[PDB]
Amino acid sequence: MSGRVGDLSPRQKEALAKFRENVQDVLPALPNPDDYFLLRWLRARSFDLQKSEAMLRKHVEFRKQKDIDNIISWQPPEVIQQYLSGGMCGYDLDGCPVWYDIIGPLDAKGLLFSASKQDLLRTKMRECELLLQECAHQTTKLGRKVETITIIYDCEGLGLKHLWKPAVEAYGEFLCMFEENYPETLKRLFVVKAPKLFPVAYNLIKPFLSEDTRKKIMVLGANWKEVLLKHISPDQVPVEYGGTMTDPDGNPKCKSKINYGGDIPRKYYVRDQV
Numbered sequence: 001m002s003g004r005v006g007d008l009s010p011r012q013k014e015a016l017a018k019f020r021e022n023v024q025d026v027l028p029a030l031p032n033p034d035d036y037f038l039l040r041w042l043r044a045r046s047f048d049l050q051k052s053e054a055m056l057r058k059h060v061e062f063r064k065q066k067d068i069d070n071i072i073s074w075q076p077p078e079v080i081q082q083y084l085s086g087g088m089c090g091y092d093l094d095g096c097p098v099w100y101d102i103i104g105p106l107d108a109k110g111l112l113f114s115a116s117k118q119d120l121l122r123t124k125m126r127e128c129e130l131l132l133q134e135c136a137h138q139t140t141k142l143g144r145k146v147e148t149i150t151i152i153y154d155c156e157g158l159g160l161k162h163l164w165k166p167a168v169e170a171y172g173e174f175l176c177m178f179e180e181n182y183p184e185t186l187k188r189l190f191v192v193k194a195p196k197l198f199p200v201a202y203n204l205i206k207p208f209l210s211e212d213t214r215k216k217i218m219v220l221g222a223n224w225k226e227v228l229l230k231h232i233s234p235d236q237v238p239v240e241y242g243g244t245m246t247d248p249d250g251n252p253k254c255k256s257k258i259n260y261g262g263d264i265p266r267k268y269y270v271r272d273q274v
C-alpha cells in the first residue's frame with residue numbers, strides 16, 4: 001500500500017480526509033493543494049496527523065519568510081549564476097525531470113567567499129521550485145501525475161577540498177531545507193563516478209538526510225552508463241553521461257542546461273574568511 005492517490009488503505013483515506021479538514025485554513029495560500037500535495041506531508045510522517053500538520057505549517061511559514069511565490073523570477077548574483085554547478089536536463093522513462101549535480105568542479109570555498117549563505121540557500125530553493133514547476137508541466141503534458149525527480153549525482157573529482165567544514169555545514173543547511181520543505185519529491189538519486197573518499201563524505205551528510213532519502217540513494221559502479229539508460233532514454237541523457245543529447249551547437253556536455261562549475265575568479269571574493 002503505497003500511500004498514493006488511487007491506492008490508499010482505509011486508515012490512510014480517513015487520515016487524509018481529517019488532514020484536509022485540519023489544515024484547510026492554510027490551503028488557499030498553497031500551490032495546488034490537491035490530494036497528491038497533502039499526501040506528500042502525510043507519507044513523510046507516516047500519516048501521523050499531528051506531525052504532518054506541524055510539518056506543513058512550518059512549510060507555510062518558510063514560504064512566507066522566503067517569498068517562495070516569487071522565487072522563480074529571482075535571478076541569483078553573478079558568481080552563483082556562473083559557477084554554481086548543476087542543472088535540469090531531460091526526463092526519465094516515466095516522464096520525471098532529471099537534475100544533474102556536478103560536485104568535482106564545484107569551488108565550495110570560492111562560493112562561500114563570494115556569496116552570502118542566504119543567497120546560496122535561496123538559489124537551491126529556487127532550483128527545487130523550478131523542478132516542481134517542471135513536474136506540473138509534465139503532469140499536464142502526459143495526462144498523469146508527475147511529482148518526483150531523478151537525480152544524477154556526479155562525484156568525479158570529489159576531494160578533501162569539498163569537505164572543508166564550512167562547506168559541509170552550509171550543504172547540511174540546504175539538505176535540511178530540502179527534507180523539511182520538499183518531502184517525497186525525490187524518486188531516485190544515482191551516484192556516479194564516486195571515488196574512494198565517497199563513503200566518508202556520505203557519512204558527513206547522512207545526519208541531514210531522511211530515511212526516505214537514504215533509501216533512494218543508489219551508488220553505481222563501473223557500468224553506471226548502462227544503468228542510467230535502464231532508467232532514462234538515451235536521447236534524454238547528455239553524451240557526457242552516456243546518451244546522445246547535445247547542446248544545439250553540438251557540445252556533448254549540454255552546457256546550455258547543465259553548469260559545470262569551475263574555480264571562481266578572485267574578482268568575485270567579498271570576504272577573506274568564513
Ligand SMILES: CC(C)=CCC/C(C)=C/CC/C(C)=C/CC/C=C(\C)CC/C=C(\C)CC[C@@H]1OC1(C)C
Pocket residue numbers: 101103106107108111112120121124151153155158162163166167168170171174175178189198201202203205213217
Ligand atoms: C549548496 C550550498 C548551500 C552552497 C554551495 C557551495 C557549497 C557549500 C558546496 C558544498 C560542497 C559539498 C559539501 C558537497 C557534498 C559532498 C558530499 C557527498 C558527495 C556525499 C553524497 C551526498 C548526497 C548523496 C546528498 C544528496 C542529497 O539528496 C540531495 C538533495 C541530492
Ligand SMILES: [Cl-]
Pocket residue numbers: 078082
Ligand atoms: Cl561574467
Ligand SMILES: [Cl-]
Pocket residue numbers: none
Ligand atoms: Cl574548528
Ligand SMILES: [Cl-]
Pocket residue numbers: 199203
Ligand atoms: Cl563507515
Ligand SMILES: [Cl-]
Pocket residue numbers: none
Ligand atoms: Cl549508516
Ligand SMILES: [Cl-]
Pocket residue numbers: none
Ligand atoms: Cl532498480
Ligand SMILES: [Cl-]
Pocket residue numbers: 264265266267
Ligand atoms: Cl583570478
